[PDB]
């Protein structure tokens, strides 16, 4: 059709290849062809026919004019598909227009009958790839070199309708260079769906990946870092940003809605991370959740060494009606930060760790933004099936520990503590002697295990305080963390209300623990205290 040819156009809206609405349907093929356009409102490729298809293989497409759209708002791409199917294979696509004079979009696919299949190609330009309004796009073994990947929209009040944009990426890297002022490297907004398997996602002014307003995202075998750089025309300057330009009705590159640097920023949407790596900068968080967001993470890693693994916000008013924020780490997911979780606004939060999830850091919250006590949504956390949480809190309302463990690293406050099937609270052995900890809780229930440190020689031990109601059948295992005692001393391990039904048994071998020449056994004389008593051992 247009094989091994050079198409060079310079006039206003003088496209390299244009398949119109008044043209016939059918497959057009281009192989070994290079397209270069520079006129105003001229794309390299323009597809506007639902029955048409274009196979563009082993060629290159470049444009440098302002690709402003006649219909209010919008900028188009060097390759734009408004209807029909584009199949690009081993292609070199580049929008080389002034950053100033144009959005630099390399590929724009929009509409219910707009489709695109991109394989083994590179897409260059500061506006990246923009997909919306029910388009369907598959991208394989490629790379969006510097403008990022932007699916869907918000605001833009203009005749709308039905289907979601559906985008599938496989082994394709996406980078949003600082120049390309894209808020996120990958943004999925509104009725949009993204499936990503394999690939490196780097950049974004405010986030690596942003999922807003009903978006549905599925990341697998991916890495999400803030760092990056490059992609483009020639070598002038790196990223304006003292630019500020003609072009018309068009933003650098889309999103976001919140800012600082978050690996994954989810609001009113759902994101699934599977075997991926997320690295947050000192300032920010691996994952930020708001407005009923749902995030799930099997395997992989979440690291925020100098910050928060998870940040929860989005919603200034708590409403019992609405569904809470939900974060689940399962299938051996690893997480590590100063704070595992950090609450910023009053919306309820549910944090679940299961399937050998291994999380590290404290759970922190922000006292109160005036909203009277019961105007604050609860912070509930659940540990199950071998998961492990090592950190401390003063902000968890309820904690269930079922066949999993909480390694408590410092004095902690928990509203209601429920244990089951060998769930345990392990009072971490301190580095310094006599540095006992206190776990204070309102209620205790179920059947669990507490590993508690005893400093016989100082007459000190860790302590469990239940202020309102202790019930259940629990076990206490004593860790000899000091030296031998020189006389008989008794340690107050557990304080419970006088009536309390709870029962505690020493789990140490034979119901006793020998430290030096002293033997300690657990005793309760009905008053609400459980004490490790300890007396001279028998010869």
Report the alpha-carbon distance of residue 28 to residue 509 in Å, rounded.
80
Report the alpha-carbon distance of residue 261 to residue 255 in Å, rounded.
14
Q: 271, 305, 306: which is closest to 288 by C-alpha?
A: 271
Report the alpha-carbon distance of residue 360 to residue 282 in Å, rounded.
16
Structure-token pair, residue 347: 């919306």
CB 286 within 8 A of CB 334: no
Intra-chain end-to-end CA distance of the chain, in Å: 102
Domain that holds residue 195: 1-539
Q: 73, 169, 65, 151: which is closest to 108 by C-alpha?
A: 151
Number of Cα atoms under 13 Å in the Cβ half of residue 330: 12
Structure-token pair, residue 56: 């563009």
What are residue 382's DSSP bridge partners?
352, 400
CB 244 within 8 A of CB 228: no
Report the alpha-carbon distance of residue 348 to residue 266 in Å, rounded.
15
SS3 per residue for 10-65? CCCCCCCEEECCCCCCEEEEEECCEEEECCCCCCCEEEEEEEEEEEEECCEEEECC
Q: What is the DSSP letter of 527?
A: S
Residue 140: its H or E element:
strand 136-140
Structure-token pair, residue 357: 């999830």
DSSP string, 392-456: -BS-EEEEEEES-EEEE-S-EEEEEEEEETT-EEEEPPPSSTT---EEEEEEEEE--EEEEEEET
DSSP string, 453-474: EEETTTTEE-EEEEEEEE-SEE
Q: 53, 17, 14: which is closest to 34 by C-alpha?
A: 17
Q: What is the DSSP letter of 510?
A: G
DSSP string, 150-209: EE--SS--S---SPPEEEEEES-EEEE-TTS--SEEEEEESSEEEEEEEEEEEE-SSEEE
Report the alpha-carbon distance of residue 535 to residue 58 in Å, rounded.
86
SS3 state at 355:
coil
Is the backbone peptide bond immediately before 243 cis, with ω within 30 degrees of 0?
Answer: no
Distance from chain centroid for Cα 222:
12
Is the backbone peptide bond immediately before 256 cis, with ω within 30 degrees of 0?
Answer: yes
Resolution (A): 2.5
Structure-token pair, residue 536: 């001279």
Please name the residues in contact with 138: beta carbons below 8 A apart, sequence gap of 6 or more: 116, 117, 118, 167, 168, 169, 170
Structure-token pair, residue 466: 């239940």
Count CB-CB contacts under 10 A for residue 178: 16
CB 529 within 8 A of CB 495: yes
As a whole number of angstroms, the longest Cα–Cα distance in the chain is 105
Q: 289, 269, 286, 169: which is closest to 221 by C-alpha?
A: 169
CATH code for the domain of 323: 2.160.20.20
Structure-token pair, residue 18: 């244009």
Q: 538, 501, 535, 500: which is closest to 521 by C-alpha?
A: 535
In the block, tokens 């299949």 appear at 117
Report the alpha-carbon distance of residue 456 to residue 35 in Å, rounded.
83
Report the alpha-carbon distance of residue 216 to residue 208 in Å, rounded.
16
Domain count for the chain, please give it: 1
Experimental method, per PDB record = X-ray
Report the alpha-carbon distance of residue 155 to residue 165 in Å, rounded.
17
Q: 137, 7, 119, 135: which is closest to 82 by C-alpha?
A: 135
Report the alpha-carbon distance of residue 9 to residue 394 in Å, rounded.
67
């Amino acid at each position: 059709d247009w094989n091994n040819q050079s198409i060079v156009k310079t006039g206003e809206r003088q496209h390299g290849i244009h398949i119109q609405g008044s043209d016939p349907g059918g497959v057009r093929t281009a192989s070994g062809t290079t397209i270069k356009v520079s006129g105003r409102q001229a794309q390299g490729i323009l597809l506007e026919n639902p029955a048409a298809e274009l196979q563009f293989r082993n060629g290159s497409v470049t444009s440098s004019g302002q690709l402003s759209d006649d219909g209010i708002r919008r900028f188009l791409g060097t390759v734009t598909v408004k209807a029909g199917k584009l199949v690009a294979d081993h292609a070199t696509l580049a929008n080389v227009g002034d950053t100033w004079d144009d959005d630099g979009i390399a590929l724009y696919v929009a509409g219910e009958q707009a489709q695109a299949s991109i394989a083994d190609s590179t897409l260059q330009g500061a506006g990246g790839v923009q997909i919306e309004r029910g388009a369907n796009v598959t991208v394989q073994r490629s790379a969006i070199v510097d403008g990022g990947l932007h699916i869907g929209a918000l605001q833009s009040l203009q005749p709308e309708d039905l289907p979601p944009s559906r985008v599938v990426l496989r082994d394709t890297n996406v980078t949003a260079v600082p120049a390309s002022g894209a808020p996120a490297a990958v943004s999925v907004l509104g009725a949009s769906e993204l499936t990503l398997d394999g690939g490196h996602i780097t950049g974004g002014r405010a986030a690596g990946v942003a999922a807003m307003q009903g978006a549905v995202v599925h990341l697998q075998r991916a890495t999400i870092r803030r760092g990056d750089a490059l992609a483009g025309g020639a070598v002038p300057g790196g990223a304006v940003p003292g630019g500020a330009v003609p072009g018309g009705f068009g933003p650098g590159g889309f999103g976001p809605v919140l800012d600082g640097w978050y690996g994954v920023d989810v609001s009113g949407s759902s994101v699934e991370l599977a075997q991926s790596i997320v690295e947050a900068p000192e300032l920010g968080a691996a994952i930020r959740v708001g407005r009923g967001a749902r995030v799930t993470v099997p395997g992989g890693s979440l690291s925020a060494p100098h910050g928060n693994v998870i940040e929860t916000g989005g919603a200034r008013r708590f409403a019992p009606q609405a569904a809470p924020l939900s974060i689940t780490l399962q299938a051996g997911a690893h997480a590590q930060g100063k704070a595992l979780l950090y609450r910023v606004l009053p919306e309820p939060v549910k944090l679940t760790l299961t399937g050998g999830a291994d999380a590290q850091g404290d759970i922190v919250a922000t006292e109160l933004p005036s909203i009277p006590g019961t105007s604050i949504g609860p912070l509930d956390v659940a540990l199950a099936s071998q998961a492990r949480w090592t950190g401390a809190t003063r902000a968890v309302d309820s904690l269930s520990i079922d066949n999993a463990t909480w390694v408590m690293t410092d004095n902690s406050n928990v509203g209601a503590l429920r244990l089951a099937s060998d769930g345990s609270v392990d009072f971490q052995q301190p580095a310094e002697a006599g540095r006992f900890k206190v776990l204070t809780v309102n209620t205790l229930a179920g059947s669990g295990l507490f590993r508690m440190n005893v400093f016989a020689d100082l007459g000190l031990s860790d302590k469990l305080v239940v202020m309102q109601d202790a019930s259940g059948q629990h076990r206490l295992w004593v860790r000899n963390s000091g030296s031998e005692p020189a006389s008989a001393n008794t340690l107050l391990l557990v304080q419970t209300p006088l009536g309390s039904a709870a029962t505690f048994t020493l789990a140490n071998k034979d119901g006793k623990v020998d430290i030096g020449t002293y033997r300690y056994r657990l005793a309760a004389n009905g008053n609400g205290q459980w004490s490790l008593v300890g007396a001279k051992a028998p010869p």
